Amino acid sequence: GSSGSSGMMEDDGQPRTLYVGNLSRDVTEVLILQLFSQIGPCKSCKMITEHTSNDPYCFVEFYEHRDAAAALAAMNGRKILGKEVKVNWATTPSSQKSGPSSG
Template identity: 85%
Template sequence: YVGNLSRDVTEALILQLFSQIGPCKNCKMIMDTAGNDPYCFVEFYEHRHAAAALAAMNGRKIMGKEVKVNWATTPSSQKKDTSSSTVVNTQRSQDHFHVFVGDLSPEITTEDIKAAFAPFGRISDARVVKDMATGKSKGYGFVSFFNKWDAENAIQQMGGQWLRGGLMRQTFSPFGQIMEIRVFPDKGYSFVR
């Protein structure tokens, strides 16, 4: 479910944005006659891509409006009442909490993000999103935790960290409060202040 859309948003634009995360089956735009904002449903082939889209796109601005992305309910409840379409979880996702990881340097792999986030708790899935055509990293990914508290803790601790810095942080934090970590992967050294 993608809501709070600008009236200028088209199905084609939504498909273009969301298919960067994973292959989309279809997109259905609902134009409300009562004058409310349009909303739409995006269907992915794979659950993990839908989960990544939810983590990546919720709260993002599309044409100047912050969109709301949520799990859609079953088709039977997609009535005129738009509030019914924002019911949260699907069964598969009830016990997973997704953390979006952005601004990754191109050499960061899925293994790297697993290693960096593993200390925060049990991970159900981790993935660097790759370009279908080139196989290169798109510079973002996601990590899914079984436990909500672990996910929130990871967001708090890792926000603004260099990912390789995340591993440094785990290694050096027992020795005192860390002010700054700077990693120079090409030179093979780091500074920890």
């Protein structure tokens, strides 16, 4: 019911996966884990280079949300190998409940 009141937040499942894009052809799975490791523990990293047209991309999963968020912002548009890498929250359709906002 569209109204103006204090928002609410329920416990569903904090995100622990981030999408890394704009990675240099020199960047590797081990390299990423090294930089991200400095911030927090990395559960697993999968570098995908299926798309050649555009720069490659890799996924970084952390043990906790605090680490993923910290590494995400720290790595978010960070300079690596002379190439700025973009890091954002890897969203998934898994979730059923959907309710965007309006601006």
